[PDB]
Amino acid sequence: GCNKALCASDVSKCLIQELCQCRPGEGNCSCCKECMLCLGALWDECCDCVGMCNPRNYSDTPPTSKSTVEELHEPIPSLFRALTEGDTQLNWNIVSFPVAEELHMCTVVYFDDCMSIHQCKISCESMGASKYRWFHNACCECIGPECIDYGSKTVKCMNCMFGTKH
Amino acid sequence: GCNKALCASDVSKCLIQELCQCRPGEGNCSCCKECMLCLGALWDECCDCVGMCNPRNYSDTPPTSKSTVEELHEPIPSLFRALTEGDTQLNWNIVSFPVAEELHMCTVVYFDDCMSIHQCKISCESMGASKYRWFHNACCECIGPECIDYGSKTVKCMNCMFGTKH
């Protein structure tokens, strides 16, 4: 957790001054601002040592955790509805879920085969979608005109689940 | 706009069949699903030619238009408030705006100097932030515990506005 070699010198220096005596983890941390200033440049690599921040290296960042979202210029909502409602394309997985779940209803299209971001924007753009979300596992999710936000965080698109549990 | 060389053959073929006679741009487009099927693989590169989708190359995608958003594991809201409320760090620009504007109040921290995404996550993580948004101009925006969503789309962080008008 704590990087002892980098932090042992400076981290102890604050402790002698008696800073960083307050745990943010439960309750208010009055000293938190003072503790950060005493650490200075080492706060990023040493806030764990004083308990002010989560341990540095414990989780292996799944690729799905990142997604990149852009809003398409000049959306064409009528097209998006027309291609969604009817017998959908096999390449397309269509999910409608209640709007504001991610935080009437929000409908998104999940492309099957994994694709590059630039293709994903183009494919959504050809669909008239208001927005697209690109998971860093490379799953592509077009966002319908109705949807308030960026749609579901779930990597629900078939034939590219790499980056998900089991 | 239209890529004549790729699309002239196939696009005309649908027109002879009398598909793609309906404009999505105003009103319902009944034929839109049929038009896409007739184009098939060329829909991405040729939907513009039939008017079903926006012209291919007209806008120079600003870097700020993309942003990548991840939700931090194990946020520490007390720390985020403590370092925000008081006399803020010069490196940090603190913006509070009403919550749900982007779609009580949402507070975000805009790092000054432009930084890599991995540093941006770490810097937000040391701050206890629930989430971070990284603009592809490389501006970094930590997201406060209060904020419902991913915070402001604006690239409001000082000393890295590259990717914005004028």
C-beta atoms of B82 and A27 within 8 A: no
Give the CA diameter of chain B: 70
What is the Cα–Cα distance from A2 to A58, expressed in whole angstroms? 11
A101 in contact with B, Cβ within 8 Å: no
Question: How many helices (DSSP H) and strands (DSSP E) are in chain A?
Answer: 5, 5
What is the Cα–Cα distance from B7 to B48, expressed in whole angstroms? 10
Q: Which two tokens stand for residue A79?
A: 């097209």
**Minimal Cβ distance to A29: which of B24, B47, B78:** B78
C-beta atoms of A53 and B125 within 8 A: yes
Question: How many helices (DSSP H) and strands (DSSP E) are in chain B?
Answer: 5, 5
| Minimal C-alpha gap between B62 and chain A (Å) | 11
The answer to whether the CB of A141 falls within 8 A of the CB of A151 is yes
Measure CA A21 to chain center. 32
Contacts A73 to B, Cβ<8 Å: 54, 59
Dihedral sign for Cα B59, B63, B64, B66, please. Answer: positive
Which of A126, A147, A149, A154 to mutate to probe the B interface, most B CBs <10 Å?
A: A126
The burial of A165, by beta-carbon neighbours within 10 Å (0-12 exposed, 13-18 middle, 19 or more buried), is given as exposed
Q: Which two tokens stand for residue A78?
A: 């009528």
- Closest alpha carbon within chain A to B65: A70
What is the Cα–Cα distance from B148 to B11, expressed in whole angstroms? 45
The burial of A146, by beta-carbon neighbours within 10 Å (0-12 exposed, 13-18 middle, 19 or more buried), is given as middle
What is the Cα–Cα distance from A137 to A71, expressed in whole angstroms? 20
Q: Which two tokens stand for residue B70?
A: 């991840």
Q: Which two tokens stand for residue B12?
A: 């005309």
Closest to B116 in 3D by CA, of B68, B165, B65 = B68
**Which bin fits A55, alpha (ψ -120 to 50), beta or left (φ > 0)?**
beta
What is the Cα–Cα distance from B48 to B39, expressed in whole angstroms? 11
**Minimal Cβ distance to A82: which of B29, B127, B153:** B29
What is the Cα–Cα distance from B30 to A28, expressed in whole angstroms? 60
Dihedral sign for Cα B31, B37, B42, B44, please. Answer: positive
**Which bin fits B75, alpha (ψ -120 to 50), beta or left (φ > 0)?**
beta
The answer to whether the CB of A56 falls within 8 A of the CB of A45 is yes
What are the sequence ranges of the domains in chain B? 4-46, 63-143
* Residue labelled with tokens 């937000």: B124
What is the Cα–Cα distance from A93 to A128, expressed in whole angstroms? 16
The answer to whether the CB of B161 falls within 8 A of the CB of B62 is no
The sheet carrying A67-71 orders its strands as A92-98, A105-111, A140-143, A131-135, A67-71, B67-71, B131-135, B140-143, B105-111, B92-98
Name the strand (E) or helix (H) holding A127: none
Closest to A133 in 3D by CA, of A148, A143, A125 = A143
Contacts B24 to A, Cβ<8 Å: 76, 78-79, 82, 128
**Minimal Cβ distance to A76: which of B54, B69, B149:** B54
The burial of A125, by beta-carbon neighbours within 10 Å (0-12 exposed, 13-18 middle, 19 or more buried), is given as buried
Method: X-ray
SS3 A140: strand
The answer to whether the CB of B142 falls within 8 A of the CB of B109 is yes
| Minimal C-alpha gap between B105 and chain A (Å) | 15
**Minimal Cβ distance to A103: which of B29, B44, B149:** B149
- Which amino acid, one-letter code, is at B98? P
A151 in contact with B, Cβ within 8 Å: no
The answer to whether the CB of A128 falls within 8 A of the CB of A121 is no
What is the Cα–Cα distance from A125 to A53, expressed in whole angstroms? 41
